Amino acid sequence: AGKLPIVGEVVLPILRGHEDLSNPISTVPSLAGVHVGTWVEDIDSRTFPLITVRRVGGTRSPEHPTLFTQPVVEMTAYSAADLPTTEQMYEDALEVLYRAARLQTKTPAGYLHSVTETLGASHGPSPFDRTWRVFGLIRLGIRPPKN
Amino acid sequence: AGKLPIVGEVVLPILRGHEDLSNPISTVPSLAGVHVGTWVEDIDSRTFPLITVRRVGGTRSPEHPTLFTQPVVEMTAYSAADLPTTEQMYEDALEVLYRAARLQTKTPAGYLHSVTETLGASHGPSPFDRTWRVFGLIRLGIRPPKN
Amino acid sequence: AGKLPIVGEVVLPILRGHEDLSNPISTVPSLAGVHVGTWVEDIDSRTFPLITVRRVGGTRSPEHPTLFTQPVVEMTAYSAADLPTTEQMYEDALEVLYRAARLQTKTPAGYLHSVTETLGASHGPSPFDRTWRVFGLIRLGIRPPKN
Amino acid sequence: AGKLPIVGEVVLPILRGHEDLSNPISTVPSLAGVHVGTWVEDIDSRTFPLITVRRVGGTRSPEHPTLFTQPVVEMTAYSAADLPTTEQMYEDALEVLYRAARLQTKTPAGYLHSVTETLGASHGPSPFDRTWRVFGLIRLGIRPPKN
Amino acid sequence: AGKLPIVGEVVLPILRGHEDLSNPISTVPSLAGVHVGTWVEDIDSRTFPLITVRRVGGTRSPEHPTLFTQPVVEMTAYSAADLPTTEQMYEDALEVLYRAARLQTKTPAGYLHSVTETLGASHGPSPFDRTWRVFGLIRLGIRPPKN
Amino acid sequence: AGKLPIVGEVVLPILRGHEDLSNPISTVPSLAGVHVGTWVEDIDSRTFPLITVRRVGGTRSPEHPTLFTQPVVEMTAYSAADLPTTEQMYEDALEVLYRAARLQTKTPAGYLHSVTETLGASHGPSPFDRTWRVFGLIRLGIRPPKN
Amino acid sequence: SLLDRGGTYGSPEDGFDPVTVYPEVTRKDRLGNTLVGPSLTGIETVARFQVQGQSGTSARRAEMDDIGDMTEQVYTMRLPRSFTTELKSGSEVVWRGERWGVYGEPRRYKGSRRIAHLEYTVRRF
Amino acid sequence: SLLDRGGTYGSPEDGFDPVTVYPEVTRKDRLGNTLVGPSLTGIETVARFQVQGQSGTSARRAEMDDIGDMTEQVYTMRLPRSFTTELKSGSEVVWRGERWGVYGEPRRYKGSRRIAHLEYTVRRF
Amino acid sequence: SLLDRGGTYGSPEDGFDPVTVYPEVTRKDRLGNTLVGPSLTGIETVARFQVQGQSGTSARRAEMDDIGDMTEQVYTMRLPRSFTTELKSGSEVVWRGERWGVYGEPRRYKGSRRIAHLEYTVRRF
Amino acid sequence: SLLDRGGTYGSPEDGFDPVTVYPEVTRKDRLGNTLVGPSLTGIETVARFQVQGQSGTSARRAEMDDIGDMTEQVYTMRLPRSFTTELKSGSEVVWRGERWGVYGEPRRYKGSRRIAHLEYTVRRF
Amino acid sequence: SLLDRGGTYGSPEDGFDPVTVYPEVTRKDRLGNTLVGPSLTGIETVARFQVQGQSGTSARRAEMDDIGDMTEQVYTMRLPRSFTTELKSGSEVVWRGERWGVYGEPRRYKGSRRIAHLEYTVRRF
Amino acid sequence: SLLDRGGTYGSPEDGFDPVTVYPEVTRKDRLGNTLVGPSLTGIETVARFQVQGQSGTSARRAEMDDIGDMTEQVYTMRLPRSFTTELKSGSEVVWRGERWGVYGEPRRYKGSRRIAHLEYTVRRF
């Protein structure tokens, strides 16, 4: 049964709402037009609003290291609009990950098996010109694709 | 049940005594004229007294993520008057949140379910010219609106 | 019934030995002439020896938030004389709080119910020209005025 | 029977896929041409992609110090290509350690007896111009060679 | 029973070997001629070797706050000679405390009831010139004088 | 029973292989010619390889303070050769301490009773021009020299 | 005087680039907090830009690799004195088709009626 | 000349701005601590303001968005020697119709009887 | 003019070295993030390199042994004004057979038609 | 000779303020530590004060509200060469009726027998 | 011409010292890592050493005493321009019979064909 | 010239003070570590002391009150060129009957036969 993916190949199709990894604009109704990625673009290219996900920890499962894994991702959300809009945008990203976990959603790279906040949506200082950042740590759980 | 709100759409009507989100001036008898918000305005516009509520953490409830939330807010009171007036004003903000929890108050965005100090009132250094600050962390509990 | 006070309105009458909040000079015989208050004055007004108490966390009690509070106060003692005099002065301030607690002393703003060190008398660096600081954390307990 | 080695003499042949310690580029199919070593070469000699192994802790076993030891190694993967290639390369290296432990892989300096992550694939800031870095801690366990 | 003392009025006669508080040179045979105090003197009178004792802080006992107390002191030893002499001087000072506790030694200010290291003798950077420093924390126990 | 020693009077004869304290060059065959001491010499005198043993904590035992003690020693290996040679030199120092403990090795100053690691061999930055440091903390037990 | 030279947006003088300047306005957010930001309607004008920020604790920050392809640029900026509008710290400028924020309030120089002028900083990150 | 130069509040010299100056008084708080602050009655006068400057560690504090729309503005201030009232760290000034605190005690220069003057700092923020 | 002096890649002036310069190109990673880096085809030109004033907190950082054999080198770098292409952050240069990154965006000096030029910084680490 | 200048406590000359100077003595605390501090009997003199000890960007320390309200002032001080007593670092000065501590030991300049003098720093915080 | 001027090792010029210079080699360690270090065969030559000094951040580092008897010395070195070999940062120098490391790569100054030279830092700790 | 004018311990010039200088001696401790410290026998000579520029962070540590009465003071010390023995880190000097340590190795200047000299820093803590 396949190989375990890097966490971005499972989370990003689920937040974006399409299987095409080359197209970073989200199409999910709660997040239409939100750019979703692993890495913040150069100022001559970046567009807000923006969701960004990075792996911060989380081992493979010690029971079977090749069959289940529990990566922890720091999810973040940025906007140039106002602080309430970036709080609602992070809440609208949790409401996608929880539903995508209930439905056990398949992606070409693997299955999203479970979701758990380990540090919930938190306001912090932003490194960009005039934008509001909120962030939190999600412990995911991921299983390999069939065959 | 409806969708769960951002924490500001529940706490602010409860501290202000209005359902009107456009008007930050509190009308609660113990906090009359206190400006209550989530962001500190430009120097040419701000006024003291001021209360700032700002989300620091706290997850959805893990056994029903779409039906209950325990957000942690940092609540901060600022004054230009004196330190006793600043801690009395934070004290009178707790006495409103605890009453609003016992009475189970409905807000158009959600119900305030319960309140708990995670870190009590504490004096600290203030970022503005000649004002005093006291702050603490409140773990709230929020339930979705009825529709 | 009453209302719970800010911690200064209970501790200061007990350290000063009089109910007049406008007069910071202590009259308790082990602390006679010591200036006691929440906020050190400008250098043109300040005098030593001096004690100061700051609110530094500690919550309302979970089971009855409107009836009993356990505020932590940082207590600090300063002198221009010598280091063993600030140790003796801080030590003599505990002897007043423990007596005032076991006697269950009433003040117009509330009753001092119990006293407990949570970080004992400790020597530290002083922010003032040629003076010694001794400090510690006291977790108090407070009950509201009976009326 | 034998003596316990420095940790590099066990895991470097296992990540490289050959017992020749003089030849740092790996030949394992998932890591073809990756440079693997304890120490980053001078800028006139660096090539990317690169994996590095550093000991960070972990004792001899307390009940037979000469017979078993559990060194914690930090493993860090660097690339000039992109972040996905860097976390793919780290997973494709960690898959070799988990297989090499399951097979009890004999190396001329000792046997790799077990493998266990204690931090997993955290993304971090790189010290080298235009390169991504991901790192984690692995608690290995190693047995001395038979003689 | 008298009032509880400040810790310097008990420890210093035990280290010095005489009840004259005005004379900082110790006479106990293991420490003949070291200077024992709570405050490092000005460089125009400072004399090495010296032992500095100061309260890092530990509470009254909660069982009877007026009858037994457990002050933690940071004890330090300094020398201009060499590091071995500075270690040996800390060991020889600690051996006086462990004996003076066993004998329940009376001091005019109180009784040294018990001794316990909470952080053992350790080397660290010295604040001044050629000298070496060794330090640790002792939780003492003190009983009031029998007046 | 005699007095307990400073930890350097026991650990150094075990690592050096002779109880002449005036001669810091080791003769133990696994690490012969290594300079073993407690204090790194001036740049005009120092020679590499070097081992530094430094007291970093560990109390007398509370059961009988004058009969048994458990110093914690930070042990550090330095070399100008390469990182693997610095690792193997630290391993070859543990292999001597564990053997010397297994025998209860006698020295003029005391008996080495037991050896354990509280932080295992780890790589770190070196304060000396073009050298590698490997270090860890050993907790080791000592007993009095009979008599 | 260099304070009064500049020309106009369609044809500047030698040292001056044409810019669109968006002065500050205040908006309410969803919860009634007041935020400063750039107006929707820009003013065509010309401006004198000069390099800034070369001190060793800030020259290191010019390019980063921690979470994204981030860079930071800093310039002092001045409009000719015929531009009577003032750019408060929420304002923005379009220069060379890039969008540059004003950064902090304007510095005021006022020594005498012929020396007097305002100088801005602009920043992009 | 420049030390004595300032006009009246209704008619400044061109290098000077009219200000209302609130000298310090002390009040007791609710628990008997004396607090310094500005008097309720202001003295109308004129003052000379010049920008206090920047460094790589302090220029980055001119505008922020950690918790609010913060800015900081630092100016030195001098009052003409006919002004015999002395301001103190609790004093405030109204300049251009906005309210500026004095920051730290006055810097007192007394090299000789004709050079002697006081300079203040004011900080907004 | 020390501006536009340099000559050509086959025959430089004295102050100038021949370089191959790889301008900005934008690419997608596996996950559709938009990265920036050097083009695969570089222009051949001449360039003026001068040691940047690496001092104090940054001087100790010239060589390190915490994880590997590591150094930093910093040069300001400038091209003759006949070179009309602009390099950007994450463009690269081959100088003296070594490969050097442009660090941060170019600094634009524009005071008048005669004086106007761009200066870059390059690093190798 | 500005080193020999300045009058007497009743009539000081122009650049100099009359002061009472309390030279150092050593007391013992109740545990037998010696401590430096000012004598009970002060010497009446005249002294010259100037506005800074040494330069620094950390001028934010001049006023604070972290605990209580506080300011720090620093002046360089000098005494005429006829004043033969030396003030060690435990000493104090009364200036304008305020009380100012000497801060650190005096700085000795001794280039030649006519240049030679001592200079002191004083603080109040 | 202070760049070309200098003696032979057996007979230095006014203000130059004789040195043995050990240029770079690479060695391979027990585990196949590639390490820089000094060659075993030295080139005898002369060199000009000047103190690099310390800024106030680092003047404290000259004699440390926390872990051992430790000092740090920083000198700037130049070799006569006829010396064609180059010391690539892993290199070492023997000066006054004691052994000094080169620190970081050489600084290259090349503004003009007669002014061009390389300068090194050497360090000992 | 100023490099070698100083007189004798019984009769200095005016710019120089008489000192007893204790050269470096090395000794074994109880455990065989080789320490360094002042010799038991001093050399009587004369020296030129000048106040060191503490104007960084060091001016805030000229007097401190956290653990004891402590007062770092720093001077730059030089001996006439007729004094042939070098001092080293942890050598000591007696000046005004106080005892001052040499701090770090001598700074060595050697521009020419006419300019060549050593200069030392000294400290008291």
Automatic annotation (TrEMBL), chains G, H, I, J, K, L:
<protein>
    <submittedName>
        <fullName>Head-to-tail stopper</fullName>
    </submittedName>
</protein>
